[PDB]
Amino acid sequence: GSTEFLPGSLIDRAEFEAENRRVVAEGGEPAAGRPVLMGITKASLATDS
C-alpha cells in the first residue's frame, strides 16, 4: 500500500507492527504479512550489521 515496503521482502515483526501502527494513526492503511521460516545461514546473512 503506502508503507514504503517492497512486496516480497523479509522484515522483522517489531518494525512491521511499528510501521503498521504509525501509518494507520495518520493516513490509514494496514499492510499485509504472513509468517515465514528461514534457515540458519539466511537468518545469519540477513542481519543489520
From Swiss-Prot:
Triggers of expression: 6-fold repressed by starvation.
Chain segments annotated as coiled-coil in the UniProt record: none
UniProt record similarity statement: Belongs to the RNA polymerase beta' chain family.
Protein purpose: DNA-dependent RNA polymerase catalyzes the transcription of DNA into RNA using the four ribonucleoside triphosphates as substrates.
Summary of subunit composition and partner proteins: The RNAP catalytic core consists of 2 alpha, 1 beta, 1 beta' and 1 omega subunit. When a sigma factor is associated with the core the holoenzyme is formed, which can initiate transcription.
Name of the protein in its database record: DNA-directed RNA polymerase subunit beta'
Source taxonomy: Bacteria, Bacillati, Actinomycetota, Actinomycetes, Mycobacteriales
